[PDB]
Amino acid sequence: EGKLVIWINGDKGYNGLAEVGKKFEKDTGIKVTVEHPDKLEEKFPQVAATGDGPDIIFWAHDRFGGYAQSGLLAEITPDKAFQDKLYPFTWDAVRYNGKLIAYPIAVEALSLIYNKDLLPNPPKTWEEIPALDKELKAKGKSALMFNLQEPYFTWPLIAADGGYAFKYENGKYDIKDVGVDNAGAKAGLTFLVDLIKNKHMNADTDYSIAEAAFNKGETAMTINGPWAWSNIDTSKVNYGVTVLPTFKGQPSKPFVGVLSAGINAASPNKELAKEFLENYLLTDEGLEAVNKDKPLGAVALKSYEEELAKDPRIAATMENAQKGEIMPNIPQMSAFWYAVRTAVINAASGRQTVDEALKDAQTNSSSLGIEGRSSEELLKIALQEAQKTLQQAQELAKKGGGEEQLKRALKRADRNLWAAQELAKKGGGGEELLKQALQQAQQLLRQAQELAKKGGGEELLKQALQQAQQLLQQAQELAK
Numbered sequence: 253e254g255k256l257v258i259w260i261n262g263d264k265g266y267n268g269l270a271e272v273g274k275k276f277e278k279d280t281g282i283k284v285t286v287e288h289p290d291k292l293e294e295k296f297p298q299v300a301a302t303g304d305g306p307d308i309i310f311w312a313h314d315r316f317g318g319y320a321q322s323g324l325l326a327e328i329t330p331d332k333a334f335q336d337k338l339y340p341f342t343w344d345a346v347r348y349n350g351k352l353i354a355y356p357i358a359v360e361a362l363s364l365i366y367n368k369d370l371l372p373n374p375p376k377t378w379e380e381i382p383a384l385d386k387e388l389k390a391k392g393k394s395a396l397m398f399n400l401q402e403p404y405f406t407w408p409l410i411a412a413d414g415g416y417a418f419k420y421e422n423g424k425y426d427i428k429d430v431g432v433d434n435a436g437a438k439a440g441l442t443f444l445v446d447l448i449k450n451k452h453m454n455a456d457t458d459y460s461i462a463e464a465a466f467n468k469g470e471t472a473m474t475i476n477g478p479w480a481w482s483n484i485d486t487s488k489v490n491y492g493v494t495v496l497p498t499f500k501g502q503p504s505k506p507f508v509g510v511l512s513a514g515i516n517a518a519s520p521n522k523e524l525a526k527e528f529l530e531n532y533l534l535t536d537e538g539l540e541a542v543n544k545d546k547p548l549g550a551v552a553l554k555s556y557e558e559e560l561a562k563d564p565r566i567a568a569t570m571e572n573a574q575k576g577e578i579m580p581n582i583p584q585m586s587a588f589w590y591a592v593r594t595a596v597i598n599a600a601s602g603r604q605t606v607d608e609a610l611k612d613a614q615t616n617s618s619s620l621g622i623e624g625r626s627s628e629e630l631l632k633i634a635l636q637e638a639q640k641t642l643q644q645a646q647e648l649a650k651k652g653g654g655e656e657q658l659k660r661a662l663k664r665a666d667r668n669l670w671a672a673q674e675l676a677k678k679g680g681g682g683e684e685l686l687k688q689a690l691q692q693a694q695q696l697l698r699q700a701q702e703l704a705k706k707g708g709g710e711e712l713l714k715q716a717l718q719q720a721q722q723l724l725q726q727a728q729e730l731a732k
């Protein structure tokens with residue numbers, strides 16, 4: 253009621269954003285706190301659904317259509333003059349059902365980052381990387397390392413030869429036509445899996461491992477976004493940023509995200525949030541402050557983009573963006589991402605073959621009927637009740653010794669979760685991923701009950717409850 257809370261991902265320039273907040277605080281008297289919670293994309297909708305959460309949330313635009321559909325975002329009202337300050341295509345990215353639901357900040361696209369000293373001439377094709385790695389392994393180095401845990405990083409290769417999320421036709425995205433299991437997607441993922449099988453990459457490589465390896469000069473290349481350049485400048489690596497390699501003669505196609513800022517519909521400070529975003533952040537000085545901390549990439553603000561236009565790294569970011577595709581913002585994007593995430597991890601680990609993995613990804617992300625609609629809504633209600641009861645258990649876990657109360661709260665949450673599994677069970681095929689999420693959530697709740705009964709793991713209890721909430725929210729987004 254007199255303070256602004258902002259949530260932004262941990263890989264962005266939250267410290268630079270805090271500086272913009274200090275300037276706002278000096279002019280208005282409103283304190284601005286910037287936070288970077290883990291699993292932010294899932295945490296926000298969970299807490300905002302109950303009327304809580306930050307006043308402002310930052311994330312690529314793909315998650316915003318789902319937030320808007322759930323009524324978690326306030327309608328933004330920038331006047332014509334302000335709108336003219338940003339590129340029209342960035343505004344298009346934050347339009348849902350005909351209305352603007354967030355403020356665009358920057359255009360992000362993955363690029364190939366390489367060590368100029370280990371590799372003066374980067375590979376123009378993915379096909380030449382296996383031979384390049386064998387050559388570098390002789391020097392105790394590797395050719396390429398990038399996050400294989402988030403599908404965002406493998407998607408450029410998957411889409412290169414034909415893979416796609418939702419087919420765009422008639423001006424809309426057909427949620428029944430998913431392209432994660434066509435020949436193009438299979439070819440791309442098989443190539444990735446072959447790199448692992450042939451020991452050119454490790455299936456367990458995640459974000460931090462690849463970043464540390466590249467910045468320490470252990471690998472010749474990595475695939476990342478503009479936010480990562482800052483840490484590379486700090487290291488002793490002479491790097492270049494360029495176009496991603498082609499696959500079967502076609503450009504890699506990264507899914508392009510427009511980092512955007514939305515205003516929580518539950519915020520009691522909507523006018524102050526608008527003032528902060530329009531008059532403080534979306535100004536040359538404001539974006540400069542954030543950019544200085546962690547590069548934003550190409551920005552939506554025309555005046556500042558003109559100051560970044562001479563940066564070769566930004567030209568590369570723009571080239572890759574032009575070759576990729578702007579992500580859809582439809583509510584089904586969460587399910588798509590989770591489905592593909594599961595498929596890539598299973599195919600990479602060997603749990604499933606590429607064909608099996610992508611077949612399930614297609615079934616899980618793709619959408620008698622009435623009966624399904626009724627049960628779907630009831631399932632969502634059961635999960636919302638479970639999330640609410642759970643959020644209460646998290647409170648009893650913060651302080652106090654109400655072991656009896658916490659036990660009851662977890663049981664109630666558990667009963668509602670069990671009811672959802674029952675409703676999903678009868679749901680039939682197509683919701684296998686949803687069922688596994690609910691089952692995993694159940695395990696965590698049982699583990700939480702055990703911890704509460706033993707009392708020697710207060711922190712582990714909170715952690716188990718948060719992981720449970722995260723899975724329940726993902727389950728909500730998987731429901732169809």
Ligand SMILES: OC[C@H]1O[C@H](O[C@H]2[C@H](O)[C@@H](O)[C@@H](O)O[C@@H]2CO)[C@H](O)[C@@H](O)[C@@H]1O
Nearest residue numbers: 261263312314315402403404405509589
């Ligand atoms: O990997 C799936 C994930 O991809 C995108 O998330 C990106 C985000 O856009 C970037 O700003 C940066 O934070 O890296 C993320 C990947 O770890 C989608 O925006 C997100 O919805 C999706 O789950």
